[PDB]
Amino acid sequence: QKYSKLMADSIIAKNITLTDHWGYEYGLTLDGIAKVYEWTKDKKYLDFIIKTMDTFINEDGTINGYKLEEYNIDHLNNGKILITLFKETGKEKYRKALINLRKQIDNHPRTKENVFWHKNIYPHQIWLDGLYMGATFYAKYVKEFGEEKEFDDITHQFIITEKNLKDNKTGLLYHAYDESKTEPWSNSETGLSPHFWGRAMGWYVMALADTIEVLPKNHKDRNALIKILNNCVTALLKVQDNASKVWYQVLDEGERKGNYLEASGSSMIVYALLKGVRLGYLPESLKETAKEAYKGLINEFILETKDGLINLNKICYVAGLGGKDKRDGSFAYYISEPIVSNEPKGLGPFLLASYEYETL
């Protein structure tokens, strides 16, 4: 049973909201639907993608709900689906919208080591999420339109992020880092947030797999990024839940009351395992592990509804650090956020993992 199509059909039929703001998770979900278009060759999937993005992309290429001057790295992620649409349809408005997003990169603020700040409102901060939204989009953009020298910038951002956010003990990477060490959530020694959040690691491993894929084969930092991906996978396999074969919201604290197996991070990790094996970044010996983990996603997180469609359950709706609610990154904080079903932050990665599983 091909869950990529079944889930795509479920998303469309259940009319999951993908149009209420310029949300990174909406492009992510559409990126999953685009894989279903690719293999089915069924225009209804492409048409759904087009119709969804018509909310945002005006004929003149301006983007509803986007403001460049906010310098929000999340706002770049939806450029990835725009690349796909431009390649598929050749429509100029998508290219103009892409030019507008690329202009953000010109002056988006950077840390002392030249990594994009997560947002203007988060000065001096690197969050793992941003590597997927920003650096990874930038890589896809450069592959299509850019100058190859720009890949050096992108790879440097991955390398510096691993240097600053990695825990030497576990090999896992913390959710966020404040170079200025001024945020109350940031460790006075290291600037790091307190915990390993499942979805944050998921963002980083997806970002690695998707970025390495578009690098020139001879790129000077290609092996370094592959090594980082292997190291992340090693670290994640150490904390995989033995019974379920999936991952917890707070990755290394599975025995702690309140923690839970979380669908979006688990799906992202399974996608990266599968894609990493397919492209040769990870050893072929991991194939059965990856397959078993995929089946674990279905077992733990998928339920059939009476109409024969499916729900994806147990998705952390949102998490972050600081901000108006002064989010402190404690265990209690990560457990406090909503757990929801049929949320695009989980749906997209589940579609993508399904596509990779089916391809294997």
Residue numbers in the entry: 2 to 361
Task: Quote the study's own text.
Clostridium acetobutylicum ATCC 824 gene CA_C0359 encodes a putative unsaturated rhamnogalacturonyl hydrolase (URH) with distant amino-acid sequence homology to YteR of Bacillus subtilis strain 168.
Crystals of the CA_C0359 protein belonged to space group P212121, with two molecules in the asymmetric unit and a solvent content of approximately 47.6%, as determined using the Matthews coefficient. The protein adopts a six-(α/α)-hairpin barrel fold with a small two-stranded β-sheet and helix overlaying the end of the barrel near the active pocket. The two tertiary structures align with a root-mean-square deviation of 1.4 Å and contain a highly conserved active pocket. The representative PatchDock results demonstrate that the conserved residues Asp130, His176, Asp75 and Tyr25 are available for binding the three disaccharides of interest. While the mobile loop of CA_C0359 (residues 320–330) may provide some gating action, it is unlikely to completely block access to the active-site pocket. The catalytic site of Cac_GH105 is slightly more open than those of YteR and YesR, and not as open as Nu_GH105, which may allow larger sugars to fit the +1 subsite, and possibly trioligosaccharides and tetraoligosaccharides. Conversely, the loop extending from the gate loop of Cac_GH105, which is not observed in the other GH105 structures, may play an important role in substrate specificity compared with other proteins in this family. Taken with the electrostatic comparison and growth on pectin and PGA, Cac_GH105 may cleave a wider range of substrates than or a different range of substrates to YteR, including ΔGalA-Rha and ΔGalA-GalA, which may be decorated with side chains or be longer-chained oligosaccharides.
